[PDB]
Symmetry: C2
Subunit: 192 residues, 2 copies
């Protein structure tokens, strides 16, 4: 059993890589099993169908982003700092995580999300929104900003990161608090 249980990461990785480069609809179980170097039995031991590989990848993206959001809100940061760190953080895990790229690709396409797993974009919007409200509440973002709209755009925008942050910073952050944020965006770009 141990052997079988041990192949699941490989199969996910293999399917991630293929879904990310070649797309979901065009990738088959057979392609996946040959890339992974395992048998069909090994694959069926963990997943009954292609869709199950999809929901597992989607599951990992959702958990990954929810974990990072939670971790970053427990470290004494201001909300906008947390939000900024979160965009750069996600970007760092994606540049090095095929699974997340595959998740992204599945989410961007019409690949359904099995309830109660919410669609990652609405989850990313929720995070961005609550973070922006707090930032408004802490005077880091103008009181008149329409948060909803920026969350909606921000999510689309994150999917150059520093350069985007600079524009938002100039346009939504009060003059006296800008510098700290411009500095952080620079440091995070430097650090990733």
């Amino acid at each position: 059993q141990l052997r079988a249980e041990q192949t699941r990461a490989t199969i996910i990785g293999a399917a991630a890589d293929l879904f990310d480069r070649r797309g979901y609809e065009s990738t088959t179980l057979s392609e996946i099993v040959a890339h992974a170097g395992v048998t069909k039995g090994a694959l069926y031991f963990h997943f009954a169908a292609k869709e199950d590989l999809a929901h597992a990848i989607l599951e990992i993206q959702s958990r990954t982003s929810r974990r990072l959001a939670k971790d970053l809100d427990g470290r004494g940061y201001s909300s906008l700092e947390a939000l900024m760190r979160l965009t750069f953080g996600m970007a760092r895990l994606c540049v090095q995580g095929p699974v997340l790229r595959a998740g992204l690709r599945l989410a961007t396409a019409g690949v359904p999300v099995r309830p109660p797993l919410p669609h990652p974009f609405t989850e990313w919007r929720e995070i961005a929104t609550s973070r922006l409200l707090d930032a408004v509440r802490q005077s880091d973002v103008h009181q008149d900003i329409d948060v909803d709209s920026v969350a909606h755009t921000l999510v689309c925008s994150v999917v150059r990161l520093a350069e985007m942050w600079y524009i938002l910073i100039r346009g939504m952050v009060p003059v006296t608090r800008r510098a700290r944020y411009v500095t952080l965006a620079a440091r995070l770009e430097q650090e990733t």
Copy 2:
């Protein structure tokens, strides 16, 4: 007659690709939704990809046209660009073809040359206009046009409220103080109009 039938098939396919996705939509679905025969559909489109192509063709051609209607009105480049974005926003709320276009682009459906990929198109048009704006001194020389173009596209992809909200933010961050009010009011005026 023929062409009207063709267009209704396009519209039906578009509405379905938009609400239900490209992959899960069937030619049989499209057929019933359009009120035609399978024969009529296969007379105008040999395959489901031919429906995608015609939708994308309509998308790119509406886009290039709107850009062209706006270009001959003596506007400043920043004004033209701003007007273009609100036009596009308005077009998306009107018929489903543009909605389907996006959905197709985002679904990962390949665009048959020589037609360019919508995102690529939208980015070039925005970028070229932003570059003219800098030259015209309505936008700071040190702005990152690419990031701005991206933001603009993303603010559209309600919609007029969101496009306006994002415009104000960009205006505060890229337009010289002395030229801001003209654009703030323009943005505000376009939101109310569209």
